[PDB]
Amino acid sequence: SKTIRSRSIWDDAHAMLEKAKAEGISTVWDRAAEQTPACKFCELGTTCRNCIMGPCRIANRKDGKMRLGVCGADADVIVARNFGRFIAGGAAGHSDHGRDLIETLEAVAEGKAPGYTIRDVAKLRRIAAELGVADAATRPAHDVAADLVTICYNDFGSRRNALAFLARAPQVRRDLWQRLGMTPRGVDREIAEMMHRTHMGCDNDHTSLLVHAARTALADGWGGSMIGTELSDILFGTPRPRQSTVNLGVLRKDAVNILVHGHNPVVSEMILAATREPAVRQAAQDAGAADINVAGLSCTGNELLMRQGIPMAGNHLMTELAIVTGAADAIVADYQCIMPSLVQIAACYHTRFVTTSPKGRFTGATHVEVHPHNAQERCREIVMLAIDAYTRRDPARVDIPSQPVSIMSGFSNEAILEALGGTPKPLIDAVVAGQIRGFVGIVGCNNPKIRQDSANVTLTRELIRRDIMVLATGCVTTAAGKAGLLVPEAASKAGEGLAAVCRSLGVPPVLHMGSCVDNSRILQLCALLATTLGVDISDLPVGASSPEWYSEKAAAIAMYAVASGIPTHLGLPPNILGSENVTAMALHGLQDVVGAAFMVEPDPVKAADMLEAHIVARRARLGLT
Amino acid sequence: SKTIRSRSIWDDAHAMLEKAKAEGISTVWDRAAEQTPACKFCELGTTCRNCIMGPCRIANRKDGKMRLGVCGADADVIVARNFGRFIAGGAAGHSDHGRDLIETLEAVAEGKAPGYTIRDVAKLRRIAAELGVADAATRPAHDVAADLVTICYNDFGSRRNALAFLARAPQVRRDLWQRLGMTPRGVDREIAEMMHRTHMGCDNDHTSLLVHAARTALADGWGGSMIGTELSDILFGTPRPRQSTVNLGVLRKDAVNILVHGHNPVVSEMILAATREPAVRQAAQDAGAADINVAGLSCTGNELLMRQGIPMAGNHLMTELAIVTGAADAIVADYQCIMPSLVQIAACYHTRFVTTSPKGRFTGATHVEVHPHNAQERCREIVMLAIDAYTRRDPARVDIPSQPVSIMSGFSNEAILEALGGTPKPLIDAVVAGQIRGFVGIVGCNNPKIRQDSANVTLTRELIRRDIMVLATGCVTTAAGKAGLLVPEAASKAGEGLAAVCRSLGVPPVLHMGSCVDNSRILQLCALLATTLGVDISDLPVGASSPEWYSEKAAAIAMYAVASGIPTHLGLPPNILGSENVTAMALHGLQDVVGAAFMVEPDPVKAADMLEAHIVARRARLGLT
Ligand code: SF4
Ligand code: SF4
Ligand code: FES
Ligand SMILES: [Fe+3]
Ligand SMILES: [Fe+3]
Ligand SMILES: [Mg+2]
Ligand SMILES: [Mg+2]
Ligand SMILES: [Mg+2]
């Protein structure tokens, strides 16, 4: 089918799209086609539902009617409020994610989380001392853990003037944030204030609204996401470079296949541990299987890739197609980006769809709730359900379409600094010498509006050929991986200078830095380079890009990158084009305020030119050629 | 004129609607007409904009097309998520309001709030002892205040299992909330979790979404709103019964008229203090004015009414018309329900439109930001701006249309118990005897869809006639006041049992209990009666109603009343009718979850019948003969 080829660049997607057609299974692409054309007002953002004096739409009519909402709000306020709440939903997703890590570490500290431990005691002591815990280096690890928990919880309270991790940002940046009123003070507080501001008759100034959206996104990047990342490393180990594989071919016909989907490693690590217990493995063999095979989806797949090397079956738009292989015996979900269609598709097979979080409820799913005190017991129970489902798999409907592609993962900042010999000097020398011209974090999702991974891959290829090193997170990981970009030998794909540096360090030209919360690592690394050099983040030769974004979380990531000084490309526009003032603030006005702005460009080669031009401009202001 | 009489029941509204039409001033009614018909999908709730795989619309078709969103979400999920975020917006308004009160009491305890003090030390010592402050009766007041501030701030953190004021609810109700997973744990936390739940691919079950909507609302009523109410009494005095007046005729031609609009008394109490300084009054006398006249709008007006007896100019739909009088020399606004059209109407006169809050920014307004450390100095500056605006008032454009009408205000729970002799027994005895059959809180807004105050007033009259005492708060206060029902002589309008009780106590049949946050006084009073009788709130002959609601805050108030066991009538439907399952849950399902449910009924006599019927059934539950 020509339509099927138009939907993805990957062979495995085409194979499963053909299989779904022959079986009568509708996909995300079919539903997108039904939802086209979209409502013009919703698309432009010129519609409001925030009270029942409405709902309102802002139109351009020759009689001048419908220029304002019933309360008097114009298109600038309505668009800005809609964008503000959109960002707040993304920040809330990462807020709750980090809060779960705090609760988990606290349970470990009190000895009430069987099977969870402090995997990286050294990092616990370093992070705790950094945040002010007295005698963190010498006191018993659990006492230090309880004092660190208290610090992170205070960031989720209402008495701080600035988040604890904000100290990593250079002083010039903290001074500018304070001057603009952008300093994030509380992870939950900024979210709550955004919902108050967007109520009828509170914040009715588009500038002020976008300013607080930046403060809310900063409370994510330097708060919710950074806490989640750093505590995840403490509980489950700091990532280190390791080999693994990617694509639908990671599923095995001869094994029980358990797909982990969602976001939080507190569940996926414990599922993986369950499948490794000898009695559970023996139950799989009693059922006729050779082994139990865990395969990751989306960000929780990234978490297992980074710390355990678990192969990843696919990213966002592969999630339905992974069930269409007919070889998934269970999908285990927690929260965020889990399309509810997956429940219906799993019902077309033997596959069990298991929910684990009180926040991630799906009508028709099997719910086995996981908490720190019962995780070890419950995850054992979930794996036993997958083995039971395996015995009823229909072999006639199994089609695992491809051979897996080799990848390298595990590039935390600790691993990067280890590869460099303990200091960022060799990396700074490479940038000053022009071998590495700059860095671009390529982040974010897939979106049915764009042929899947076409922009992700093209942009990655363009940047490394221009001696720009790519830091990959989120669903871009799978795209870079399937394109053969995540291995040390991929230096052959990069420009002469980047390839030389990569070969001298033994690293790939695209560094997998983890999940979407792990974009906080990109913030930490920028802050480190800026502080070492004595400049602002907005002076560094850096950029960020989400060529195929879809979610509120991706928009919050883009906003905190911009607000931290990182020019940020988006493949598609947010629903803001109904207000030229808001659009001009996002694309230009922010540049004059925070030192960076949004870019919207659907052509990935054009996007490469723009990100490169920003990097060239910033190199010149550092005195570099 | 027929159209004009159709828009309000009041003479002062009629006069300003004529003046507004003659002057070409666009009102909330004119814009509501332009926005009719509304978008069918928006009004039904079957539209989603939570990610850019969409936006999506759900149609009902036999062919099954557009039955699901791009992510596969159906109408139940889309409607429930929309209503969840709607509720969260209202809870957030009360959250930030209560938070501002904590910060003010802290500044007083620190000695860093010139012009503020602990007005009610006895209540501070009583609230602090109640919440667990050690030696609250003897330790220095500022030490006790600091320990209370710590407790309230902890309820804005992420470490509690249940909010501090939740201990007021009866044990049976606390046990049900705990089993349902509905117990409010953190004011900001429940708001953030709702925004997480409503992100794509998180909570995709309408029952679970509605249960957290209840938890989020309960974090308002027993958290943000109850903290706001109790600290306001501590900082500004516990209200006690007093007389005052209402309507546009409270503005005086010979005086500088300052309208306080918005919500937080932290601003309006200091505006009033400023108008009493001898030097400032001399400046007004220099300008030709005989006095400085402060008058209240909406909830901040309710606050000044309850504690200082300051006359009230109007409620929500009177706000624009108050400027149309041509005698408003300044509007002093903070946040919530402040229609931005007021800025344009102010621009049509001499009136200064002054914003005071970093959250309540309005393009084109004069911003004089107020915080505890500078309120005394800044509020003086604001009054001077009003005096200067007075000098430019055009006498020929002034039309103050009515003479003010007498009311009685200040019925805090402390005031009610004092009137009863110290204990609630005389009220309990009157209910047992059937002199008072029950109590209904009539709360909430005006809405252009309903002839202003018509349903508010008709419901109030119907209920007292049936021996049901009415507790009024919010913008219903102005309606009851202008109807002449807020005075002890209104006993002649009540049934025989209610009139005898009111005359023996010397109180009106309609008790003004304060602002929207003071709906927490109604929760406190229901909890007291239930604990005294040893029953649940869902056993009490109580009810709640908002016949003309508009705002997210009102929907949140209705939800926390429903979730606390109080049957709640709404005059208009939330945007949920696109899902029969969500609608059936709101109107029927919740009875079997929380012991109460919503009602939607635009006929206020019908609404009285339904509220009365619930009261009859609850009297039977208590064995009353
Ligand atoms: S807040 Fe204003 S623009 Fe939005 S729905 Fe209500 S009246 Fe319309
Ligand atoms: S969350 Fe689902 S229903 Fe809502 S806009 Fe995105 S794809 Fe459409
Ligand atoms: S669906 Fe109502 S405006 Fe888009
Ligand atoms: Fe992601
Ligand atoms: Fe109100
Ligand atoms: Mg715990
Ligand atoms: Mg500021
Ligand atoms: Mg203070």
GROMACS .gro file of N, CA and C in nm, chain A residues 10 22 39 65 99 102 111 156 168 266 285 288 326 393 467 488 499 536 538-539 544 589:
model
   66
   10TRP      N    1   1.007   0.306   0.850
   10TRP     CA    2   1.064   0.180   0.896
   10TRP      C    3   0.993   0.059   0.836
   22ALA      N    4  -0.495  -0.625   0.704
   22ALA     CA    5  -0.552  -0.757   0.675
   22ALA      C    6  -0.636  -0.812   0.789
   39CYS      N    7  -1.097   2.110   1.388
   39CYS     CA    8  -1.167   2.236   1.410
   39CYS      C    9  -1.068   2.351   1.400
   65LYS      N   10  -1.842   4.120   1.537
   65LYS     CA   11  -1.887   4.035   1.646
   65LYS      C   12  -1.788   3.921   1.671
   99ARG      N   13   0.787   1.299   4.221
   99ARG     CA   14   0.729   1.275   4.353
   99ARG      C   15   0.725   1.126   4.386
  102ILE      N   16   1.066   1.024   4.511
  102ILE     CA   17   1.087   1.066   4.649
  102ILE      C   18   1.020   0.968   4.744
  111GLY      N   19   1.312   0.140   5.550
  111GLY     CA   20   1.311  -0.006   5.544
  111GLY      C   21   1.174  -0.066   5.520
  156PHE      N   22   0.874   2.042   4.687
  156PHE     CA   23   0.733   2.022   4.658
  156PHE      C   24   0.643   2.093   4.758
  168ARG      N   25   2.272   2.478   4.055
  168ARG     CA   26   2.357   2.435   3.945
  168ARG      C   27   2.362   2.538   3.833
  266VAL      N   28   1.034   0.271   3.883
  266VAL     CA   29   0.999   0.201   4.006
  266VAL      C   30   0.914   0.078   3.976
  285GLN      N   31   0.932  -2.194   3.152
  285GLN     CA   32   0.978  -2.315   3.085
  285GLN      C   33   0.874  -2.427   3.094
  288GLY      N   34   0.637  -2.410   2.814
  288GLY     CA   35   0.687  -2.435   2.680
  288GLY      C   36   0.780  -2.329   2.626
  326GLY      N   37   0.151  -0.998   1.729
  326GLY     CA   38   0.087  -1.118   1.779
  326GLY      C   39   0.171  -1.196   1.878
  393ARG      N   40  -0.133  -1.815   2.322
  393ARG     CA   41  -0.092  -1.741   2.204
  393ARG      C   42  -0.128  -1.818   2.077
  467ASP      N   43   2.938   1.827   1.210
  467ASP     CA   44   3.022   1.827   1.330
  467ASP      C   45   2.949   1.883   1.453
  488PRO      N   46   2.948   0.322   1.847
  488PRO     CA   47   3.076   0.390   1.822
  488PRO      C   48   3.117   0.393   1.675
  499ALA      N   49   3.383   1.289   1.411
  499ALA     CA   50   3.425   1.150   1.403
  499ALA      C   51   3.559   1.128   1.473
  536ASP      N   52   2.694   3.249   3.054
  536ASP     CA   53   2.557   3.202   3.069
  536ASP      C   54   2.533   3.083   2.975
  538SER      N   55   2.298   3.079   2.773
  538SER     CA   56   2.265   3.142   2.646
  538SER      C   57   2.389   3.182   2.565
  539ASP      N   58   2.509   3.165   2.621
  539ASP     CA   59   2.632   3.188   2.546
  539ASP      C   60   2.691   3.059   2.488
  544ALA      N   61   1.830   2.275   2.089
  544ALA     CA   62   1.738   2.167   2.122
  544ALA      C   63   1.634   2.156   2.013
  589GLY      N   64   1.004   3.741   2.071
  589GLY     CA   65   1.006   3.819   2.193
  589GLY      C   66   1.090   3.757   2.303
   0.00000   0.00000   0.00000
